[PDB]
Design a protein around this ligand. Structure first.
Ligand SMILES: [Mg+2]
Ligand SMILES: [Mg+2]
Lengths: 290, 315
């Protein structure tokens, strides 16, 4: 059983109740029990349950209550990465590298599990105290999510939008995700989103994105290999943009790369970190009753 | 019979900052504000004009200047257009007339905001009101004895409760809405899917006031609806998305009706002398309640709600 602690805000503009077990913190999302418990909600849970990468926010369990169906998720006790960088400064090239390796390991895994682009929402990066680990891909993140969402009238972090998302009508989603990773790397190193600055002037930000007009300021001193990786990622033409496997073989990435993050197959990740499907199915059944 | 006696405006309002860093919502309620030539409501029982009570919600984005400007100006702009359309006192149903007057009003304000139409300042200067990326929604309702007129632009909406079935009087201008999507794309603009359907990946609406930078894809042309009042009418609710994001039409109306009746049953209707000279406490009750309900349902946006009682008397 768990004990109420707070009501924090979720990842993609959502709501959750922070609770506590073990001395472990958990994030619990809820969903109106009145037969909102379709087939969309079942597949989406079982899907997310199959995602076992340590840098993915992972499904813990599902509890039935008189009010709703409770979705217990793993909690990111470090919070949002950007809000971190703000009240702590830009990270060093070595701290940035640590986390970037984790991201790529995670993105790579998600891509392999068929999860990407708007299903993965890389604008949302979280941190957790329990390596440090950066954590992506929370429950209410898919395009077809049954989880309630309340996005703003204006888009939050447009820098994450790859130019081909604005420019073309057909493009690879996994490759658009590379650009996003670039954005996450830049913010870690500089302490500010790249193509943006007066902020919230979308005209200027979009202008800079489309012309890939960024500038690493002088107060930030980073190696030439790092600047190269960034220049290889921030290219408007998807076809000339560096790929994930290519990133995995780049010098900057390879330096101080731990052994476990040298994982090819997706099935050794699953065994690496190791509630039953019958339990989940039994509870979603009892959940259709208001 | 309805065209020979003005109605008493019964209303209550909430407009709060909620969990946001700024308040960019604004509203305006101007009862007894304008006199409506009867031919604009009736046709072709004398009373040459009906008193029209103005209600407005303006949900701003990118800043507060444009929502605030609507608050201070729009009703006056609307008044001017009503006067202009007494050059029709010479020369075309009611719908077309209202649609026409409301389009010119919303367009005038838009122009004043971008500094292409002359406006008053503390002699009639051309000065922009705000940056090119700041804008606002606008939903307004004219209530008189005979008719309700709603003119909507953006994702705030107005909902009428008629008997037992909720019926909205505006449809949200979201970029993935069929005609809207089409209009944009066919015009040469782009709607992307990113944290919802967005014009060019940025703005979660297809219509608004301001937002120069997304012209002429994001337009200030409103969608006016002309609704004759009925004896079954219970109430009218205008609100920003702060409310509609967490609650459906039907439940909002029902809750609002309950609380109105709840206050009347546990306090009885006040004397005619007080009525319409300020906020009706039963409406204020409903407004206040819906407001806190939204906050508990998890709404993190600015919240603005105007509840308007449409019932002659409740016994
Ligand atoms: Mg607002
Ligand atoms: Mg709002």
């Amino acid at each position: 059983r768990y004990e109420l602690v707070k009501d924090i805000g979720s990842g993609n503009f959502g709501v959750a109740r922070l609770m506590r077990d073990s001395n472990e913190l958990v994030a619990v999302k809820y969903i109106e029990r009145g037969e909102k418990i379709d087939e969309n909600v079942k597949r989406e849970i079982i899907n997310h349950r199959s995602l076992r990468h340590p840098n993915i926010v992972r499904f813990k369990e599902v509890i039935l209550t008189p009010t709703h169906l409770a979705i217990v998720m793993e909690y990111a006790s470090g919070g949002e990465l950007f809000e971190r960088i703000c009240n702590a400064g830009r990270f060093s090239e070595d701290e940035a590298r640590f986390f970037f390796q984790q991201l790529i390991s995670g993105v790579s895994y998600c891509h392999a599990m068929q999860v990407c682009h708007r299903d993965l929402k890389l604008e949302n990066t979280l941190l957790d105290g329990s390596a440090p680990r950066l954590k992506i891909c929370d429950f209410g993140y898919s395009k077809s999510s049954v989880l309630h969402s309340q996005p703003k009238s204006t888009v939050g972090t447009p820098a994450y939008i790859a130019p081909e998302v604005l420019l073309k009508k057909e493009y690879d989603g996994k490759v658009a995700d590379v650009w996003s990773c670039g954005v996450t790397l830049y913010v870690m190193l500089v302490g500010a989103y790249p193509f943006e600055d007066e902020p919230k002037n979308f005209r200027k930000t979009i202008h800079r994105i489309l012309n890939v007009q960024y500038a690493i300021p002088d107060y930030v001193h980073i190696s030439p290999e790092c600047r190269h990786l960034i220049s290889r990622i921030f290219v408007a033409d998807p076809a000339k943009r560096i790929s994930i496997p290519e990133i995995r073989n780049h010098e900057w990435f390879l330096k101080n790369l731990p052994a476990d993050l040298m994982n090819d197959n997706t099935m050794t990740t699953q065994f690496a970190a190791s509630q039953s499907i019958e339990e989940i199915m039994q509870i979603i059944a009892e959940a259709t009753v208001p | 019979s309805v065209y020979e006696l003005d109605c008493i405006p019964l209303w209550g309002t909430v407009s709060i900052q909620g969990n946001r860093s700024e308040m960019e919502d604004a509203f305006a309620v101007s009862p007894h504000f304008l006199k409506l030539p009867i031919k604009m409501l009736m046709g072709d029982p004398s009373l040459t004009h009906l008193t029209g009570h103005f209600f407005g919600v303006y949900d701003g984005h990118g800043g507060h200047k444009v929502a605030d400007y609507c608050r201070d100006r729009l009703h006056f702009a609307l008044a001017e257009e009503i006067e202009r359309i007494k050059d029709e006192l010479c020369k075309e149903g009611r719908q077309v007339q209202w649609d026409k007057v409301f389009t010119s009003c919303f367009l005038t304000v838009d122009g004043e905001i971008e500094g292409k139409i002359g406006r008053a300042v503390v002699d009639k200067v051309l000065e922009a009101v705000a940056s090119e990326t700041v804008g606002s929604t606008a939903v307004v309702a004219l209530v008189c004895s005979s008719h309700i007129v709603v003119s909507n632009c953006g994702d705030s909406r107005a909902v009428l409760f008629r008997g037992k079935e909720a019926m909205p009087l505006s449809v949200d201008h979201k970029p993935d809405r069929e005609d809207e999507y089409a209009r944009i794309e066919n015009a040469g603009g782009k709607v992307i899917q990113w944290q919802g359907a967005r014009v060019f990946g940025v703005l979660a609406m297809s219509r608004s006031i301001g937002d120069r930078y997304l012209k002429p894809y994001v337009i200030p042309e409103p969608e006016v609806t002309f609704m004759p009042r009925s004896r079954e009418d219970e109430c009218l609710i205008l609100a920003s998305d702060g409310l509609w994001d967490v609650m459906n039409n039907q439940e909002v109306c029902e809750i609002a009706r309950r609380r109105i009746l709840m206050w009347h049953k546990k306090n009885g209707a006040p004397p005619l002398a007080e009525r319409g000279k300020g906020i009706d406490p039963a409406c204020q009750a409903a407004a206040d309640y819906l407001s806190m309900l939204a906050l508990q349902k998890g709404s993190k946006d600015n919240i603005s709600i105007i509840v308007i009682d449409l019932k002659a008397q409740r016994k």
